[PDB]
Design a protein around this motif. Structure first.
Motif, PDB file in Angstrom:
ATOM      1  N   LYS B  38       0.821  -1.200   0.000  1.00 43.41           N
ATOM      2  CA  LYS B  38       0.000   0.000   0.000  1.00 43.41           C
ATOM      3  C   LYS B  38       0.860   1.257   0.000  1.00 43.41           C
ATOM      4  N   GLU B  39       1.894   1.235   0.822  1.00 46.19           N
ATOM      5  CA  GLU B  39       2.790   2.383   0.968  1.00 46.19           C
ATOM      6  C   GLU B  39       3.450   2.780  -0.351  1.00 46.19           C
ATOM      7  N   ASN B  40       3.711   1.815  -1.236  1.00 43.71           N
ATOM      8  CA  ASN B  40       4.347   2.109  -2.519  1.00 43.71           C
ATOM      9  C   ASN B  40       3.393   2.009  -3.717  1.00 43.71           C
ATOM     10  N   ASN B  41       2.095   1.981  -3.421  1.00 44.00           N
ATOM     11  CA  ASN B  41       1.020   1.860  -4.416  1.00 44.00           C
ATOM     12  C   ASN B  41       1.259   0.744  -5.428  1.00 44.00           C
ATOM     13  N   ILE B  42       1.720  -0.401  -4.938  1.00 41.13           N
ATOM     14  CA  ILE B  42       1.834  -1.596  -5.765  1.00 41.13           C
ATOM     15  C   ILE B  42       0.548  -2.413  -5.602  1.00 41.13           C
ATOM     16  N   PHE B  43      -0.071  -2.706  -6.744  1.00 41.83           N
ATOM     17  CA  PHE B  43      -1.392  -3.314  -6.789  1.00 41.83           C
ATOM     18  C   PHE B  43      -1.305  -4.760  -7.231  1.00 41.83           C
TER      19      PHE B  43
END
Ligand SMILES: [Mg+2]
Ligand SMILES: [Mg+2]
Ligand SMILES: [Mg+2]
Ligand SMILES: [Mg+2]
Lengths: 271, 286
Positions: B38-43
């Motif tokens: 979430k912190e690095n916006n990896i989905f």
């Protein structure tokens, strides 16, 4: 009846496809008549490469009965790369049998781009009509006949090159682009076309095709200036290189397609 | 670790793919976390359709644990047609789990209701993906498609394992490394259902690909819509199966729903009708 005999697994060095007539291997270069119907200029096309595939399959001139095999360079299998917005080959790609560009002649049967809807299969003999022709300079003169399967739904409406513009708008542009750029990912230069890339019409195409048939007739009769080329055939009884036994010496049909390296998926942006 | 459970042969009506964790099916809609990081916006992206294929495989919203099944039109298998110069889908095509294009409100960017599906994802990397794959992607931008008049955002994304991923951080980088792709993307989603007899689609913003910051905002909105849905609080959940095996605070949590799924019965791909080969030319003739 023409069928195919596959040796080995697709996408390997061992892979070969022979064309069979009523169960028996024949030469894909020499034994398939150029004409299915001479009076109406219906040609037999040997298909090498299905549309939207990558493996560079070709009739090999140097092996007996001239099976289709994968091209190699320095022992590595050759795959044409995906060149955006294209996926693999954008035509069913093959050749006219009993033709030869006598070498400036490019040393191979004349190449055929078949533009119909159905994706073809390697070693397929289909019947086509010629619509036009382009002159690529690849390195040498490398004509590309534009043709359509006579069984295509659109075939009755396509008779000359202007009909390709009508029913397949943009395909001629795509063809120009594709042949210009397709070896750029390999580290080779852009290719060039004669006539500013124009496709000449059907009449012009028939003239070029006839010439290459005449050269092959001199080739198979043993009257050519033919080193590297195996002229064994099993259907032309009065040729020096007739040998019915050649058909019998071909191994029996072999395997599931081998995997293709994932690198071949890659889309190159060089358009 | 995510794996797949395949029932039947690809390109048949019986084909299903469930996504598994620990060798047991979970909901592909509800149980795969939207964020890998979430912190690095990896989905997490659920892949439906590999690049250059046609079969319109999609998460089945109305079936328990939401397996991927081929869509049908009036009972027949749906294959997206080849629209020149394209071959099938020109991206690895899928969805973000735990999202929903809410069909019950007009979305202000497009003035249209949502298409009732998870947000769609166009993954642009070199490797061709597989159906039921869960891959990890970064968002690069977003386009506002109106798909038959419905809000139908398309996220532009890249697999974090792609060799180019470190160089792709916002939408402008897509044009740099993939020149022409965004323009083709606009065309593709405009024209792809013309061979089906549907009208051309349109985009909001004249088809502009909005940037990563804009994309994250819309993805958040669709995740918020899904949170309402899965809590049982949507004004109209459209008969969507909300059964899940990982969300204990939801009314439809059921760890054992997983046990009821049949075992794998994977068969070889069935042949596809040769009609699906056809290349459609939609205009441009002299
Ligand atoms: Mg060559
Ligand atoms: Mg040639
Ligand atoms: Mg739909
Ligand atoms: Mg959608």
């Amino acid at each position: 009846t023409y069928t195919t005999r596959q040796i080995g697994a697709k996408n390997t060095l061992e892979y070969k496809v022979y064309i069979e007539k009523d169960g028996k291997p024949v030469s894909a270069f020499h034994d398939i008549p150029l004409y299915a119907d001479k009076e109406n200029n219906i040609f037999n096309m040997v298909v090498d490469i299905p549309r939207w595939t990558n493996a560079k399959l070709e009739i090999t001139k140097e092996e007996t009965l001239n099976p289709i095999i994968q091209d190699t360079k320095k022992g590595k299998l050759r795959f044409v790369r995906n060149c955006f917005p294209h996926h693999g080959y954008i035509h069913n790609y093959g050749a006219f049998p009993q033709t030869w560009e006598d070498p400036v002649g490019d040393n191979d049967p004349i190449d055929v781009l078949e533009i119909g809807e159905t994706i073809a299969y390697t070693g397929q003999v289909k019947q086509v009509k010629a619509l036009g022709i382009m002159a690529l300079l690849d390195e040498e003169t490398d004509w590309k006949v534009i043709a359509i399967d006579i069984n295509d739904p659109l075939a009755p409406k396509l008779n000359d090159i202007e009909d390709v513009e009508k029913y397949f708008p943009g395909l001629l542009r795509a063809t120009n682009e594709w042949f210009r750029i397709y070896k750029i990912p390999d580290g080779k230069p852009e290719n060039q076309f004669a006539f500013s890339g124009e496709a000449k019409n059907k009449k012009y195409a028939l003239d070029i095709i006839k010439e290459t048939h005449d050269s092959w007739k001199q080739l198979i009769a043993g009257k050519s200036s033919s080193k590297g080329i195996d002229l064994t055939n099993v259907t032309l009884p009065d040729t020096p290189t007739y040998s019915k036994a050649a058909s019998d010496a071909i191994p029996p049909a072999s395997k599931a397609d081998a995997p293709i390296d994932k690198s071949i998926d890659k889309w190159f942006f060089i358009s």
